[PDB]
Amino acid sequence: GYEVHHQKLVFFAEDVGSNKGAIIGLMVGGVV
Amino acid sequence: GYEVHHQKLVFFAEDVGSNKGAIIGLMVGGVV
Amino acid sequence: GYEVHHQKLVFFAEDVGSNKGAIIGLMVGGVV
Amino acid sequence: GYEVHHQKLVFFAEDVGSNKGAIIGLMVGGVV
Amino acid sequence: GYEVHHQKLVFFAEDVGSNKGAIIGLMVGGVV
Amino acid sequence: GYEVHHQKLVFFAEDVGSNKGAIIGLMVGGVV
Amino acid sequence: GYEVHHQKLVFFAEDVGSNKGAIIGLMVGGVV
Amino acid sequence: GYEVHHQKLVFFAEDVGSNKGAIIGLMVGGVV
Amino acid sequence: GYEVHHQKLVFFAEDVGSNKGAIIGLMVGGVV
Amino acid sequence: GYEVHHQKLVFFAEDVGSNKGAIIGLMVGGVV
Amino acid sequence: GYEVHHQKLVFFAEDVGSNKGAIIGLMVGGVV
Amino acid sequence: GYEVHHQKLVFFAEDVGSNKGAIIGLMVGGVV
Numbered sequence: 001g002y003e004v005h006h007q008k009l010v011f012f013a014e015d016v017g018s019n020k021g022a023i024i025g026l027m028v029g030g031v032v
Numbered sequence: 033g034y035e036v037h038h039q040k041l042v043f044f045a046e047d048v049g050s051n052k053g054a055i056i057g058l059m060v061g062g063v064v
Numbered sequence: 065g066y067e068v069h070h071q072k073l074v075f076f077a078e079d080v081g082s083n084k085g086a087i088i089g090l091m092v093g094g095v096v
Numbered sequence: 097g098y099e100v101h102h103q104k105l106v107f108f109a110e111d112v113g114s115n116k117g118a119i120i121g122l123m124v125g126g127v128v
Numbered sequence: 129g130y131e132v133h134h135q136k137l138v139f140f141a142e143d144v145g146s147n148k149g150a151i152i153g154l155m156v157g158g159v160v
Numbered sequence: 161g162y163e164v165h166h167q168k169l170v171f172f173a174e175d176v177g178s179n180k181g182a183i184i185g186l187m188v189g190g191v192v
Numbered sequence: 193g194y195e196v197h198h199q200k201l202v203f204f205a206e207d208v209g210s211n212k213g214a215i216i217g218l219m220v221g222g223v224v
Numbered sequence: 225g226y227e228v229h230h231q232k233l234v235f236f237a238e239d240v241g242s243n244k245g246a247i248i249g250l251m252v253g254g255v256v
Numbered sequence: 257g258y259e260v261h262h263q264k265l266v267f268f269a270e271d272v273g274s275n276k277g278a279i280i281g282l283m284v285g286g287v288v
Numbered sequence: 289g290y291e292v293h294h295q296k297l298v299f300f301a302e303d304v305g306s307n308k309g310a311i312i313g314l315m316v317g318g319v320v
Numbered sequence: 321g322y323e324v325h326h327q328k329l330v331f332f333a334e335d336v337g338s339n340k341g342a343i344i345g346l347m348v349g350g351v352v
Numbered sequence: 353g354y355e356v357h358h359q360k361l362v363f364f365a366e367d368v369g370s371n372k373g374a375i376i377g378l379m380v381g382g383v384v
Contacts, residue, residue: 005134005166006038006070011045013088013120017145018049021288022175024152025315025347029061029279031158038070045120047079047086054143056088056173057283057315059249062095064133067099073126077109083117088141089251089283091123091217115224121251123217128210131163138170147180149320149352151381155313155345159190181352185379187345192373196228205237206271212239214274217249220265220297223256227259238271244307246277252297252329253286263295275301276333276365278310284329284361285317291323298330305337310367314346326358338367339374347379 199224 269275 001033001035002133003035003131004037005132006040007134008040008136009094010042010138011122011124012139013045013141015049015052015054015086015141015143018052019145020143020148020150020175021053021055021320022143022150023055023285023315023317023349024173025057025283025313026152026154027059027279027281027311027313027345028156029059029158029311030063031160032063034066036068039072041071041073041124041126043073043075043122043124045077045122047084049084051085053285053288054086055251055253055283055285055315055317056090056141057251057281058089059091059279059281059313060093060137060171061247061279061311062093064095068101070101071103073105075107077120079110079112083112085118085288087118087219087221087251087253087285088120088122089219089249090121091247091249091281093123093215093245093247093279094125095245096127115222117221117223118253119219119221121217121219123215123249125215133164134166136168140171141173144175144177146175146177149181149349150175150178151183151317151347151349153185153315153345153347153379155187155311155343155377157189157311157341157343157375160192183349183379183381185347185377185381187375187377189343189373189375193226195226199231201233203235205235205239208240210241212242212269212274214242214244214246214277216267216299217247218299219251221254222263225257229261231263233265235267237267237269239269240271242274244274244277246274247279248277248299248301248331249281250299250331251283255286255288256293259291261293264297266298268300270302273304276303276335277301278308280312281314282312282363283315287318289323292325294326296328296330300331301333303333303335305335308335308338309341310338311343313344316348317350319350320352321355323353323356324358325356329361330363332364335365335367339370339372341373342367342370343375345377347381349381351383
């Protein structure tokens with residue numbers, strides 16, 4: 001079998017200084 | 033031939049400041 | 065044979081006072 | 097014969113009067 | 129032989145009270 | 161066929177004080 | 193005469209072991 | 225005075241740990 | 257002075273060969 | 289002078305054949 | 321006169337063996 | 353109040369024999 005290593009994923013959301021309705025449309029489909 | 037797997041997921045969300053029409057449209061297609 | 069898989073999921077969500085007109089649209093399709 | 101180790105799941109969220117008005121939409125599949 | 133497969137993903141979102149309406153759009157297909 | 165080494169992906173979103181109302185659109189198919 | 197307010201929610205699906213490894217990240221805020 | 229409010233939500237899905245990890249990410253904020 | 261409010265949310269996924277998906281990231285910021 | 293409110297959100301998915309590397313990344317903000 | 325507020329959003333997905341790798345990115349901020 | 357109109361948002365996918373690796377990117381951030 002193939003050996004594998006550990007992984008790490010961190011998600012943090014907080015908006016400093018509200019106002020301005022910004023708009024971001026970004027797509028990054030990884031590659032196999 | 034020994035294999036091991038491990039992970040770590042941190043998920044934090046905190047709505048502070050105040051209101052504000054903003055939109056994050058983002059997609060991250062992960063892969064093996 | 066021996067097989068071991070570890071993980072750790074931590075989730076924290078908090079909104080100061082009351083709701084906040086904003087919307088985060090993120091899809092993070094992960095993989096085992 | 098499939099073998100796996102123990103895991104850790106922690107979840108905490110603030111109580112919102114009525115349902116969450118504006119909101120964070122994060123989809124993170126995962127494994128049971 | 130010996131092989132290790134892992135990744136690390138960090139996602140941090142924080143909009144900074146700036147002018148009215150900024151707009152960023154980006155798409156990154158990938159490569160075989 | 162090819163071995164895999166360590167790696168790291170960081171996604172940091174923060175509106176950069178641009179002029180009044182900025183707009184950026186970029187697409188990057190790939191190579192063959 | 194009493195104010196009218198009710199709803200209709202129906203859910204039907206077939207889950208074997210675990211969901212369909214495919215994933216729908218759908219956020220439909222809304223308020224009751 | 226007199227007011228009428230109703231809603232209708234139907235979820236129909238067949239899920240058996242299938243092939244192909246596909247992923248749909250849609251955010252539809254909305255108000256009121 | 258009669259007021260009427262309604263809505264309709266429907267999700268349909270067929271079995272045998274999971275559905276499309278592929279990677280689609282759509283954000284449709286409603287109206288404030 | 290009567291106000292009426294309605295909506296309609298529908299997700300329909302059915303795909304056989306097999307896997308498909310396709311990637312749609314779109315953001316349709318709106319107006320202020 | 322008469323006031324009416326309706327909408328309609330539908331996602332329909334069906335595909336029979338589509339070519340290798342297609343990709344599209346679209347961003348449409350809006351007008352003040 | 354003010355007269356209210358409506359619109360329709362339809363996203364339907366049914367791959368039409370496109371070319372090999374196609375890639376389309378468009379952004380419309382601007383004002384009159």
